[PDB]
Structure formats: C-alpha cells, structure tokens
C-alpha cells in the first residue's frame, strides 16, 4: 500500500498472479503451493505498481531506473548527512552515468 495503487487493486492483481501460479503449479515437486504462489503474486503486484501508478505512463525498466536513482540518492544522503549533488549520484550509479543524465532522469520522472 501507499505506492499509488489502492489496496483492492493490489489485491486483484495479486489474484491474477495467483491464477498464473495455479496454472503453472507442478505438485510433483512436493513444494507447498504458497511458496510458488508468493513469487507470482509479488510479480503481479510489482508489475501493477510499475504500470498504473503514474498519470504519465513510464516504461517498467525506466521505473526501475528511477527507483534505483531514488535508493542511491537515499544512501548517499544517509552517508553524507545532507542531500547529494548530481555528480555524486552519477558517481554512485557507476559507469554510464553523468550529471546530465541524472538531471534528465529526474526531469523525466517529474509527476
């Protein structure tokens, strides 16, 4: 809850994931059903959040990138005891990332 999707919506998409699990479940493996189901439900919920949470729709992998930028900035602000600069975030993101790309990513991610 709290990621932009209502409780009931998450419940329904989770139900869809449960359906997928039921269709894919192989009982011969002796693993309990909840084990297999949990992954599909989690996947369905995550996919739902990635898909429907924004008025301006953003591609799933791009959402992942945004979230990674978020967690990175959080870590950096946690170690530096203050909000990080674009250059610092670019450094922490590793290869391929400069300040321009971080800024553009933040701009694109604006709701």
């Amino acid at each position: 809850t709290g990621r932009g999707l209502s409780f009931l919506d998450l419940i329904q998409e989770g139900n869809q994931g449960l359906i997928r699990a039921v269709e894919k479940f192989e009982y011969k493996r002796r693993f309990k059903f909840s084990t297999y189901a949990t992954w599909w439900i989690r996947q369905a919920i995550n996919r739902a959040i990635a898909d429907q949470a924004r008025t301006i729709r953003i591609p799933v992998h791009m959402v992942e990138t945004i979230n990674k930028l978020s967690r990175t900035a959080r870590q950096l602000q946690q170690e530096l005891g203050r909000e990080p600069t674009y250059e610092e975030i670019a450094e922490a993101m590793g290869p391929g990332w400069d300040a321009k790309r971080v800024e553009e990513t933040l701009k694109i991610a604006q709701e």
């Binding site: 959080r74 946690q78 005891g81 600069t85 674009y86 800024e103 701009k107």
Partner: protein
Amino acid sequence: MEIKRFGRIREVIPLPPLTEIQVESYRRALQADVPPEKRENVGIQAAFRETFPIEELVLDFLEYRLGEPPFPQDECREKDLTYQAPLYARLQLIHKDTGLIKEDEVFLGHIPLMTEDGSFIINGADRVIVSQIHRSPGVYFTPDPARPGRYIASIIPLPKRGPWIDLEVEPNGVVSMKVNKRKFPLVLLLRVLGYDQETLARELGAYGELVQGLMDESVFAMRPEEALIRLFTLLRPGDPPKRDKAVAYVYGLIADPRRYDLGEAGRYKAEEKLGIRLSGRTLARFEDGEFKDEVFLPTLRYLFALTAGVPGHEVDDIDHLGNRRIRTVGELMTDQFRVGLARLARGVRERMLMGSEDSLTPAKLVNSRPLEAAIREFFSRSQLSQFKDETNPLSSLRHKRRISALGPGGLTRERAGFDVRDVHRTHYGRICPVETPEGANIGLITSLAAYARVDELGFIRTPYRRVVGGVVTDEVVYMTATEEDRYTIAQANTPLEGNRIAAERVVARRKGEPVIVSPEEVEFMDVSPKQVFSVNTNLIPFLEHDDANRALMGSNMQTQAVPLIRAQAPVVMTGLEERVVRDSLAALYAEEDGEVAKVDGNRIVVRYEDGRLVEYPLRRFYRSNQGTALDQRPRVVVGQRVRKGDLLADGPASENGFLALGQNVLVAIMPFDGYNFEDAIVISEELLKRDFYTSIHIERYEIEARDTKLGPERITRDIPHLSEAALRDLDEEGVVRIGAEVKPGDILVGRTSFKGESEPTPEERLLRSIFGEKARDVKDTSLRVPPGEGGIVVRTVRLRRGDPGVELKPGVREVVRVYVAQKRKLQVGDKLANRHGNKGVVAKILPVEDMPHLPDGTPVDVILNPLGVPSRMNLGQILETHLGLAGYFLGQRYISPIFDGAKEPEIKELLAQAFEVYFGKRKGEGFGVDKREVEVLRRAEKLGLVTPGKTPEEQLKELFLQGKVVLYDGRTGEPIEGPIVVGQMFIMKLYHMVEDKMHARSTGPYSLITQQPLGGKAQFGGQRFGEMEVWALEAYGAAHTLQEMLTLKSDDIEGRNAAYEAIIKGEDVPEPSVPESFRVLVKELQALALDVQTLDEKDNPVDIFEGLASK
C-alpha cells in the same frame, strides 16, 4: 529635547521578553544546549522515547544530537534555502535471541531552526508559526441540553491522540458510554476492567440509588474475558472475535500510551478535577495480563455525585481559560515530528521482516524520508505556518504573539459560534479584549497580553502583586484563571501611600465580578493596566477616551504602517515604544561598555572594555516580505563612549531607539470645500517638499532559462527584431545594468526561446517573399516591467549551471534576479491613519498658499473633518491634538501611560505655558491684536467660548486653553468665523497605496477550460462580474450591456475577436454568439450521461457546436 512623563503608577516589574512565547517554546522543544544525558523527557526527546523501542530483532533509541547550520541565515535567504540544523540519532539494533548488538549513529535529516527574533526561514522566505488555542484535555462535565436534570461527562485527550469518550445517563436508567459514534453500556467496559458487583455497589451506593439502574446481571455473570470478547464484538462487528485481537484492540483504544495520550495538562486537570492521582497519561492500564482502571470510575463517580446534586461538584465552563490552552511552536512541531517518527517506525517494522534476518544495521532499517516529509509539510504547507508580516518591526512582533483558534486540530469558521468568539471574563490579563480582526475572523484570531506568559502546561498566566493586611508587597505571582478565581484582586490604580493601601474602599474582582471591598479583604492587586491589553493596544495613548471598536482598528492598522525615511516618534507616547524596538531585534545595541572604533554606512566597529574588537555589519536596503525596505542607520560617531545596552544603530521605522511608525504633523480639525467628505483627508504639498511620508519599496523580479525539447533557452543581449534603443540598458549578458531607470515596457532580463514548429500562412509566405527576409528561429521571451511598476535597479543576481556553489532544479539552466527599488512620495489615493482608529485616504494636495494658516504665517499640514469624531467616539485623537499643540510650542514630547496618563488640568497648564510663547513673543515683537482676531473673538463670545468683558489677550488664552486657535483662510485671507482646534498629531502611512492597486485591462490572458479572463493584477486579469452585478444590470433593464458582459467581453471567442476587429475598424460591434462556458456545461452534462439539446420554436435541434461535435 525634553521628555515629560505622567502617571503615578509604579510597576514593580518590566515587560517580559515579548518573543519568549516562541523562543522558550522552541528552545524547550529542541533541547539543543542541553547535554543528551541531562535532557528532560520533553519535545523531540519525548517523541523518540514514545516511538522507541521498536519491538516487531529490536531497535532501541539511545540519544540524539543537532549539528551546526551548513549555511547562515542571510545565506539561506539569499539562496532560497531553509535555515536548519542536521539531526542525528544513535541507535542500537539488538537481537534478543542471540544477544547480538549492532550500534550506529544514523542521519535522520534536518530540523528547521528558530532565528534570534523568534521566526523561521523556510525556502528563503521568512515565516512565523502561530500558536493555536484549543480545549485543554481532561475530564469535563456539561449540562445535557435535552434532559435538564442530567449531565454529560466528556473525556478529552490531545488532538489526534485518541477518540472522545462520552458518559451519559440514558432515560431507561442505564449508563451509556459513547466511543467512535458507537454507544454501549458502561457496565461492560467496567467488567473488562475487572470490577465486581460488590465494589460497584459499595462505591456507587451512596449517590441516591443511581447505581441500581447501572447494574446488569448478564454482564456480571461473565468473567472479564467473555466481557472483553463481547465488547470487541460490539465495537467491531463482522470481525472474528479472536481473544488476542480483542486484547490488542481494546488496549490500543484505551490503555496504549502510543495510540492514546492525555496531555500533561490533561493529566493535571483530571487529577485536580476528580481529586485523584494518575499513574500515567492513559485512561487505563494493561498490567499482569489484565486491565486496570484509572480514569473511568472517578469520572462516573463524579457524574453521579453531580447528578445527585452533591455540594462541591460543578459543571465546567468550556470557554474558561482554565479549560482552554495554547499550543505553541514546540508542541506543534513535536506533534508532527511524532507523526513522521511513527511513520518511520512503520517503515522500520516492515524492514525487520524482509531481507536477510541476520545481517542488518540500523542504517538499513531506518528510512528518514517520512520524517523529513512530515516536518517539511508542517513548515511549508500548514495553516499555522504563515508568511511573515514584516512591514515594520511591530508587525512581526505582533505576528509572533498572535493566537489562532483556526488551523488543523481546531475550529473551522462555521464551527465557531458566539461562545468561542466572545471575550471571556478570564481573558483579563491574558487575552487582549481589544485587538481582534474586524469581519469574519473576529474572536478567532487574538493577541497575547503584554505581561502574559504561557506556562509549561500551556495555560496563559498573568502577574499579580501580593497584598498582606493593607500592605502591598513587591513580590509577583503568575496565576492561571482557575487559581485567580480564588482570591480578591484590587485594581492597579487604587490609591497608595507607600506600600500601604490609602483608600477606605477599594475596587476589586472576585471571579471576574467587580466589587467594592475593604483593604483587609484584599489578597492581591493588579500589576499594571498594561497587562490587560496587547502590545499594539498599549501603544495607543488616551485609550480610555477611545471607543473599543475604533481602538481595534487602530491596533490592527499599526501593523500596516510603512517605514518612512524621515520617520519620527509620536509627540504623545505611552512609554512602550522603546521596549518594542528593543525586543524587535531590528535595532542594534552595544553588548557591553566600551568605545566606538569605527562608524560607517555599511558597518560599525566597537572596542569594548574587554579589549576585544567587535564588528557589526549593518543591513542596508534589504527587501522585506511585503516589499518594504528594512535598513539600519548608525546613530553614533567615531570615538563615542557607549555603555551596556546603549543604542548603536537605529533599525527601520525607529527614531533614536523609539518606535517611529509615522510622522508628527500640524493638523487642523475643520471641513474644507467637501474635500474632507466622509473621512477623506487633505494634505499640504509642504509634506512632499520636505520628504515627509516618503517610503522606499523594492520589488523582486525573476526569470528562468531552461532546457527545452526544442532547444535551450538563453539569456542574452541579442534579442530578435529589437532596436538599440530597447537594448540600451542591457549589459553583454542581457541583464539590465545596476543604477538604470526602468519604466513599464522596459526589458529587465533578455531571453530567447526556440519557436515551436508551425506552418506559415500563405500571407506570411507572400510577406516573407516581398521583404526577402528569413523568419528567425528564436522568439523574444524577455522579462519585461509590468504596468504601473518600475524604478531604479539596485541589484542583479545571476546563478548559472556548472558554476561552484549553485545547483538549480532539474531542467533549469540559469536563474536571474533583478531587484528594483522606488522612492514613493505621498500622493492622492494613499491611505493615512492614526493610533485611535481614525483612517482616511488623501483626496487633495493643496499648494501652501491655499492652506489654512496661523496668524504668524505657519500653515497646517493635515486637515481632518470633525464629522468623523462624534459617531466613532474616539476622543483620544483630540487630546493628542491638544497635548501635541502644547508640545509643538514648548518644543517637548510626552509620555502618557495607559489609563494612568495626563489629565485635563495638566494639559491646560501646558497650554498656558505654550500660549505664553505663542503670544508673549508677538507682544514683545511690537505687535497687537488683529482686527480679524477681534471679529473672531466677538463670534467666540457669542458662542459662549470666552467670558465677555475680558481683554482680547485673555480671551485668546481662554480659547487656547480649549485647544482652539485663530485660523486664517489662505485663499481669502479672511479668518475662519470660529476658533478651530489645531495641534500636533501622529499620523501613519499604511501599506495600502494606489500605485499598487490601480489596474486596468482591455484584452489579455484567458482561462484554459472556461475561456474567460483571468483574475488578479499579476496575471493582467479582468474584473469579476458576479451574480449580484448581473442582478443590478437586470434591475436596470440594460439587456445589451448585460449581454456584452456575458458574451463579447468574456468567453465568446468569435464574438470577442469580431468585436475587437470592429472597434479598431471603426465599425459597430457585431451580434454576439454562444458563450463557450455553456458548451463546456453541455459537454460536462454529456459526461454525466445527460442529453442537453438546444431547440428552436419548431423544437428542431440547433447545433451550437457548428458542425464540429457530431459525425
């Protein structure tokens, strides 16, 4: 000049620190200067202690610390940053199974710091957190409106910290408890608490057999567990009655200190009312597996005792200031901090399940985002967080001391009836009965009394002097209203010889009731009249002669006074004007004794006794929130010997350390050619000549150049299709040069933006071909001066991308700020007012030769109409005029304290002493009485003003003692047929000026959906023609005018285009068309599945969408 102060009342104590209500509250909240181990359990500390330990792995709180601000206050204001300190918390994660302990210091974000003057800096702007009054937590008993002989018991916790429980005696005889809109028998909850029939019988048996109705066999039959399950099924239907769920729910509802918190004031009031002691701040406890009652039984007992009519039991007045408390900055901030902390705790608990159950630090477990978000929400978006009012020092000083009944966790405007807005008897010495907003906000917004302070419990206290026997001590006691109601308190003006009461009969109060009392019955005495009124009200001389309704306006308008360059202190002061300036912090004083080393416009260097050389920089021409100029000027010279607390530099709106909210002008009270009509004011051009009522104002302009998908916006001097005349005052980079004069239409900052793609019309093709000039890629987006504004450019600030120390929001390349200041002379339409509630707009500025004048040639400054006085009943301005005359001729100023000031005889004496100078000089100069003076004296004795038979000089003296003088009409030269009141009056220039309010619009911006013109001057909007105006036009039977308003001048697009074209072509305007908002209405009704069809007389469809909306 000489300063003569009146009044015999001696105040044993000076005014308290005026901003202490803010300062002490926030200081107590942060506990920054207190070492962590020695911190009391309050504020932030209390929040941490409440939130931790987080059980679920176990995370516990050790201690917190606050660092130093990364940037100073001035820097924060400059760079649009919040002034704040970093908050850290030492946390240890413990595994109870393993014994494992991992400890680390985590960064929880920043907390905003309060400045020296008791304000905050939020995103570069100064803000104030207004204290919020509300009902104090505790146990109350109110009369049941339905059933006269019965009562309702109300259990109130802190706001957002629990539900309200109601104890009622139902007509059927059973005692009901109301929680969360649900009612049930109290007997059940009592049974859950472990009560037995015997205990309830012996406890409640005495009270008139009321207990018998309460008793219920079925409830007592079942043990507390079954009763708990039963209660759970009653409160939460449909929810399976798991026993642990019931325990958890009931605990969380009543006994949980985390979900239910009575106030400290709540606990204290409960203990005091019920005569018991609480083990904690909860209504009950969960101890040794069961529930134990704390509050409920004493409240039920008190309820029964009240219903039975037992002596010593009373109902509670909910507007009484014993039952009403103040929530200051600290409490609010701590509350929101507590919320964010709870959210952070939720996040922690969620983090203590997922991930690896073995390897976890406190840094991984704690996310500070909810906390930072909660705090930022409180400071930025709360209603109690207001844009600081800093027109003058008194404005902000008052703003910080204001108390609001509105805001979150408090009254809405419809909720507030007569009871809450009323002035309670307990407001005496605590809440000012005078200073409150006129209109809808009346009684909701109030002001803290001068001598009042808010205690630790949140109740306002006021000081009183102890009186033992007939002797008045110098020891002062701050009392709450409840404790005040105990004693008999004599008035402060009661006659005294030494410390002994000199009156046989004194005026005193018992529970607010005025009474005549013998000196033996006098337990206490008022400290001063000043304690009864606010800071603003206490600055009003002759307040006793002013009707409260006007004094209100005076108080409120002092806030609106604009700082003048030649500003002076009033000739009639109350003696509070020094202290206001001193506490304001605007003015600069010397720390210790010493000698002044340097004096400059920009700075003052002082060498103290210690030998240390301290340099104080001075604030010069800074722009306040309301655009008034805050600037400090040095009042000392190099090598001057100064003492501790001596004035070094004067702040804004201050003269020699005294509050200067305006100027002292020579005023005459008389009608003038209808130019004085209905409170209007006439002024002399001489005021403009000597730069009186001239004020400096600075406006801030901003423009951003950002990256676009069409290419980068650039700030440059190169602007398409512009002459060199237009680009004249712009530098190489495109920014206007400092010191340049800019007028409406002039460019401040040049900017170009890449034109959006489009296809040129055939006309444009032909034109382009004719002139042989290619259409430019970029368009002129330059920031220009709006209509009615302009002035001298005093500053330029530029912030780019990729330069050290500066970073803008994403997408924004660069930001430029241009500060333009203007010298505003007093003009027609500007608003003036005095401290007595007399206010008016300047309608006419006459040349000096037209102005009425004294016989010696001295012209008056302001002409005020006498018709404004009698209906308003503010006579203070008259006395101020007389004493001002006396002071004008004697060349001195006065201090007239509140309610104990200069009375008539003394003013007459001063008037005589003044008359000696005003006349004796003339007689010595070899001049006698004038003919016109003789005629005026004739008409005067005809009016019974002077006694017949006395000499002309004696009669003129008799008139002068009445505050009236002979006045000559500057136009004719003939005198006014009667004696007229003339004297020095203190008049302020308010923040409302025509230059700011004048606005007009032909055509302009329209709204997105409605296609109607925008609102406000800032958007170049049109005026709103509302329902009542439409009613007016209908009543006039002006149908084409109304149709113009509804169509051509608004949302009729084709209509307005054709109308404009017709007017510029000299043609008459065409027939209007369908207003667009009606089409919007139709489509919006279609969205609601309703079919709206416009029909002709034949009932055939008419298309108002003109071929566009149907396939």
